[PDB]
Amino acid sequence: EFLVEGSTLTQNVFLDEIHATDWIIARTEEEMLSLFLNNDRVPFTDQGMQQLASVPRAIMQLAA
């Protein structure tokens, strides 16, 4: 005896696809929070912009 249909929500939207994206979001938020608290300041330039981009560029690598 086992679960069937894979816990869909609509025609072809499975539960795990929601769970994984929610994990990605809730991980990026935590990592962004842990970045304003370590460094003092994040300047408002491209230098600071790529610094914020560094978080998703690592979460996607860790997710693939």
Binding site: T21, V42, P43
Partner: protein, 52 residues
Amino acid sequence: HEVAQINSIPEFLGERWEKRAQTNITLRGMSTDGFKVDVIEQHVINVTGERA
């Protein structure tokens, strides 16, 4: 930091050989300044899965 070589250069000034010496003394110190700049204090991120 360092005191350099010391030379002697006597010069005939005012009808008399005036004894003289000269060297180079170099210091070493950090830099101070200040300019007004702007800062980020919030974020926003959007995540989408292209094809579910």
